[PDB]
């Protein structure tokens, strides 16, 4: 029953805060301490993510089992699109937190992470190239939540409403009718790239776990376990 303007206001209001990392500038990084910082951050964001998801229109109407499945499927995609959004105003860097702004050379500290940093940076660059707007970003993040696990009718109606909302935003911003469908497509194709990065990230996290590089919280272990790598 929500209008586009109401949809946007709801999603903007539901936005989680930007958290700080436990970065300690008195010491140099190790592979272990960098992984510790990133996973400690992820774990604290997940608590906010869970509460954000409950505010996405239609999500709390689902069974608890369906809610669990969607978040299990999407959580790293959602962390990543948030990171890429935060990092837009910082070319060449990833703003994991206000006190943890890393370039690709710092990513080399952890085995295999620089390749993932490079994908996240490229995506941040794409956001910049497109001049992605905050209103568009919150729509995309909600689409990830509802879509990523959906093929494993109410949800599709909600997804259609978010599509309506994106077009409304573009129309309000003065894009021509043709520019509207072209940009809708450009934004949604980004979600293929975010899925790709999440799958690579999930394999990387699993590897770190399996090499006893870093202790993961029980919650993170279960979110990772859901992906049955």
């Amino acid at each position: 029953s929500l209008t586009a303007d109401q949809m946007v206001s709801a999603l903007l209001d539901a936005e989680p805060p930007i958290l700080y990392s436990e970065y300690d500038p008195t010491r140099p990084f190790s592979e272990a301490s960098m992984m510790g910082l990133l996973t400690n951050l992820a774990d604290r964001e997940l608590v906010h993510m869970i509460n954000w998801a409950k505010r996405v229109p239609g999500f709390v109407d689902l069974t608890l089992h369906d809610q669990v499945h969607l978040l299990e499927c999407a959580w790293l995609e959602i962390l990543m699109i948030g990171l890429v959004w935060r990092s837009m105003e910082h070319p060449g860097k990833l703003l994991f937190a206000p006190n943890l702004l890393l370039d690709r050379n710092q990513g080399k500290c952890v085995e295999g992470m620089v390749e993932i940093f490079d994908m996240l940076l490229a995506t941040s660059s794409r956001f910049r190239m497109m001049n992605l707007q905050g209103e568009e970003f919150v729509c995309l993040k909600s689409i990830i939540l509802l879509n990523s696990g959906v093929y494993t009718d109410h949800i599709h109606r909600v997804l259609d409403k978010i599509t309506d909302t994106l077009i409304h935003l573009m129309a309000k911003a003065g894009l021509t009718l043709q520019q509207q469908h072209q940009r809708l497509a450009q934004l949604l194709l980004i979600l293929s790239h975010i899925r790709h990065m999440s799958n690579k990230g999930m394999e990387h996290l699993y590897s770190m776990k399996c090499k006893n590089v870093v202790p993961l919280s029980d919650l993170l272990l279960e979110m990772l376990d859901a992906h049955r790598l």
């Binding site: 608590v47 869970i50 608890l64 809610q67 669990v68 978040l71 979110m223």
Partner: peptide, 8 residues
């Protein structure tokens, strides 16, 4: 499952 509890 922890997420199941947290969602409540």
């Amino acid at each position: 499952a922890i997420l199941h509890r947290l969602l409540q």
